[PDB]
């Protein structure tokens, strides 16, 4: 039966002067809004907790996709997060295994996205020049 093409798009977010303390960064960091295009009526953004906000995730950085604005009832979207290293390569990817149902104001993400001590280990190259660069790929689907 006829349907709609999968709508794929991406967003790169650079968080400068990344630090591991509440002062300097605050508990919730928010990205600018993004979408697939100009004619797109949906508005998305990312939100990071540099330290997870519960006991289970306190040793991790958390990362979420938030649907800011949508006119339609709901949106089904599959999403994938990764960290870009200094070569521009994706690393430490974490991906939804199915599409999740989004409504205006709903977020979906990973409270245990990456361990803080792994991020801070300079051997891992994920904070070159104290900059965390995150890359989000989204597929808006009918499924």
UniProtKB/Swiss-Prot annotation:
Effect of residue 115 to C: In NSDVS2; dominant-negative, increased BET proteins stability
Result for mutant: residue 100 to A: Strongly reduced affinity for substrate proteins
Top-level lineage group: Eukaryota
Region annotation Important for binding substrate proteins: where it falls in the sequence: 100-110
Location of the protein in the cell: Nucleus; Nucleus speckle; Cytoplasm
Tissue expression summary: Widely expressed.
Outcome, altering residue 98 to Q: In NSDVS1; gain-of-function, reduced BET proteins stability
Domain MATH intervals: 8-138
Spans annotated as Required for nuclear localization: 48-143
Disease link: Nabais Sa-de Vries syndrome 1: An autosomal dominant disorder characterized by global developmental delay, impaired intellectual development, speech delay, and variable behavioral abnormalities. Affected individuals show congenital microcephaly and dysmorphic facial features, including round face, small palpebral fissures, highly arched eyebrows, and short nose. Nabais Sa-de Vries syndrome 2: An autosomal dominant disorder characterized by global developmental delay apparent from birth, impaired intellectual development, speech delay, dysmorphic facial features, and additional anomalies including congenital heart defects, sleep disturbances, hypotonia, and variable endocrine abnormalities.
Further comment: Antigen recognized by serum from scleroderma patient.
Assembly: Interacts with GLI2 and GLI3. Homodimer and homooligomer. Heterodimer with SPOPL. Each dimer interacts with two CUL3 molecules. Part of cullin-RING-based BCR (BTB-CUL3-RBX1) E3 ubiquitin-protein ligase complexes that contain CUL3 and homodimeric SPOP, or the heterodimer formed by SPOP and SPOPL, plus a target protein, such as MACROH2A1, PDX1/IPF1, BMI1, BRMS1 and DAXX. Interacts with IRF1; this interaction mediates IRF1 proteasomal degradation. Interacts with HNF1A.
Comment field on protein domains: The BTB (POZ) domain mediates dimerization and interaction with CUL3.
Free-text function comment from the UniProt entry: Component of a cullin-RING-based BCR (BTB-CUL3-RBX1) E3 ubiquitin-protein ligase complex that mediates the ubiquitination of target proteins, leading most often to their proteasomal degradation. In complex with CUL3, involved in ubiquitination and proteasomal degradation of BRMS1, DAXX, PDX1/IPF1, GLI2 and GLI3. In complex with CUL3, involved in ubiquitination of MACROH2A1 and BMI1; this does not lead to their proteasomal degradation. Inhibits transcriptional activation of PDX1/IPF1 targets, such as insulin, by promoting PDX1/IPF1 degradation.
UniProt-recorded name of the protein: Speckle-type POZ protein
Organism: Homo sapiens (Human)
Shown chain mapped onto the complete sequence: 29 to 166 of 374
């Amino acid at each position: 039966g006829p349907g709609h093409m999968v709508v794929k798009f991406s967003y790169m977010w650079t968080i400068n002067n990344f630090s591991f303390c509440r002062e300097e960064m605050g508990e919730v960091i928010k990205s600018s809004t993004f979408s697939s295009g100009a004619n797109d009526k949906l508005k998305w953004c990312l939100r990071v907790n540099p330290k997870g906000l519960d006991e289970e995730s306190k040793d991790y950085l958390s990362l979420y996709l938030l649907l800011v604005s949508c006119p339609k009832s709901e949106v089904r979207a599959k999403f994938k997060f990764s960290i870009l290293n200094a070569k521009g390569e994706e690393t430490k990817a974490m991906e939804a295994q199915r599409a999740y149902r989004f409504v205006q104001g709903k977020d979906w993400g990973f409270k245990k996205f990456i361990r803080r001590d792994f991020l801070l280990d300079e051997a891992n190259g994920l904070l070159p020049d104290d900059k965390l660069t995150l890359f989000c790929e989204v597929s808006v689907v009918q499924d």
